């Protein structure tokens, strides 16, 4: 069974008039790093080149951030996948969108498992 103290990362989305907002909620028990970038996508089938930057600023635990991009008058759909590419350039957390704006993320690659 998966290891304990196994937290995750949630990210909320909110599309407005030719614009899209993405909120983060470091639910981890460690801490978030900066100089990261976001690799959000409308849905996944035929998304856009929507690419946001996390800036050099980092995020802490139980923290929170709000990134706004544009233009973007699209229509979010169930599938909107996201990816947080740290300074390294390799996504660490990813998650899709659905009914709710906020959806768990988690790494696309396993970390450890007994």
Swiss-Prot record:
Stretch list, region AMS1-binding: 1-114
Superkingdom of source: Eukaryota
Post-translational modification: Deubiquitination by UBP3 is required for full activity of ATG19.
Signal peptide: none
Domain comment in the entry: The coiled coil domain is required for the interaction with LAP4.
Note: Present with 1250 molecules/cell in log phase SD medium.
Reported function: Cargo-receptor protein involved in the cytoplasm to vacuole transport (Cvt) and in autophagy. Recognizes cargo proteins, such as APE4, LAP3, LAP4 and AMS1 and delivers them to the pre-autophagosomal structure for eventual engulfment by the autophagosome and targeting to the vacuole. Involved in the organization of the preautophagosomal structure (PAS). ATG19 association with cargo protein is required to localize ATG11 to the PAS.
Record note on quaternary structure: Interacts with the vacuolar aminopeptidase 1 (LAP4) precursor and mature forms. Also interacts with AMS1, APE4, ATG8 ATG11, and UBP3.
Protein name: Autophagy-related protein 19
Residues of the full protein shown: 254 to 367 of 415
